[PDB]
Amino acid sequence: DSRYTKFLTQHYDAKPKGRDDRYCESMMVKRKLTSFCKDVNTFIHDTKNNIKAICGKKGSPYGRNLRISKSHFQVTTCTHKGRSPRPPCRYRASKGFRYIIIGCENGWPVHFDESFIS
Amino acid sequence: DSRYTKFLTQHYDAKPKGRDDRYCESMMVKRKLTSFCKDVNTFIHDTKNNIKAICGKKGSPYGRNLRISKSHFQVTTCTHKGRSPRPPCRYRASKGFRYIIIGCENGWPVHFDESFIS
Ligand SMILES: [Zn+2]
Ligand SMILES: [Zn+2]
């Protein structure tokens, strides 16, 4: 599954190396998100099985093509902190344990909604 | 100023047409931010003079190359709400009146920091 694999590349990191700003700066490069300095990207620290389950009965519909998780997930959200959109890109990390919203297609996670949840 | 003009294209809208989801969807296209569905982008509803002043004495240093405004600004933050990164792109709007963080170069606004402020 192409879109599922792309989602994993962008958002899945089961054993994160530190969850700090350096982690974000390294991972944004390693996962190919710095062609321009992408402003927001969240890495999820949990199993692929648990993330995928959000697209089934362990998620709730959250408007068209979105599902919100019924369970909290450990996450690290990387946000751009520089003045230039050209790499190298500087990031701040924000750790969280919260419900997450994902875009689903035919039972598979294909996107991560990066908007604010409170 | 090329980078200043780019900033204005991306972030300046003095008389916004409605500040709702449709506003976001229209403006993200009009301001050329939907080649892929950019996940977050804020439009500022104030004068160019007031925004620029953030890069001077009406801002405070907020870490390298960033300044936080001393005054609140009316803003509409557009966030992607779809499962696909390919246009057409669907958005939600979030209106705010808050301090804003911008990236400055030689006294000119050149970037908008899209991270969470509380
Ligand atoms: Zn940026
Ligand atoms: Zn998106």
Author numbering:
A (entry chain A), B (entry chain A): 3 to 120
Q: Can I see the authors' text?
A:
Angiogenin (Ang, a 14-kDa protein), an unusual member of the superfamily, is a potent inducer of blood vessel formation that was first isolated from the conditioned medium of cultured HT-29 human colon adenocarcinoma cells based solely on its angiogenic activity. The murine Ang family, over the course of evolution, has expanded to accommodate six members: mAng (the murine orthologue of hAng), mAng-2 (also known as mAngRP or mAng-related protein), mAng-3, mAng-4, mAng-5 and mAng-6 27–31. Experiments have shown that mAng, mAng-3 and mAng-4 have angiogenic activities comparable to that of hAng, whereas mAng-2 is not angiogenic 33–35. The main-chain of both mAng-2 and mAng-3 adopts the familiar α/β fold that is characteristic of other Angs and members of the RNase A family.
Interestingly, analysis of the symmetry-related molecules in the mAng-2 crystal structure revealed a two-fold crystallographic dimer that is particularly intimate. The buried surface area at the interface between the two molecules is ∼1100 Å2, consisting of 33 amino acid residues from each molecule with a total of ten ionic interactions across the interface. Interestingly, in the mAng-2 structure, His82, Asp41 and two water molecules from the protomer in the asymmetric unit, along with His113 (an active site residue) from a symmetry-related mate coordinate the Zn2+ ion to complete a penta-coordination. A reciprocal set of interactions makes up the symmetry-related Zn2+ binding site, resulting in a head-to-tail packing. In the mAng-3 structure, the binding site architecture is very similar to that observed for phosphate and sulfate ions in other Ang structures and both anions ligate the same five P1 subsite residues: Gln12, His13, Lys40, His113 and Phe114. However, in the mAng-2 structure, the central sulfate ion interacts with none of the above P1 subsite residues except for the catalytic lysine (Lys40). In mAng-2, the productive conformation is observed for this residue. In mAng-2, Lys40 is expelled and ligates a sulfate ion occupying the active site of a symmetry-related molecule. The mAng-2 structure also reveals Lys40 to be reoriented out of the active site pocket, making it ineffective as a catalytic residue. Although the essential arginine is conserved (as Arg33 in mAng-2 and mAng-3), substitution of Arg31 for Val31 in mAng-2 alters the NLS chemical character. In our structures, however, we observe that mAng-2 has a more open active site than hAng or mAng.
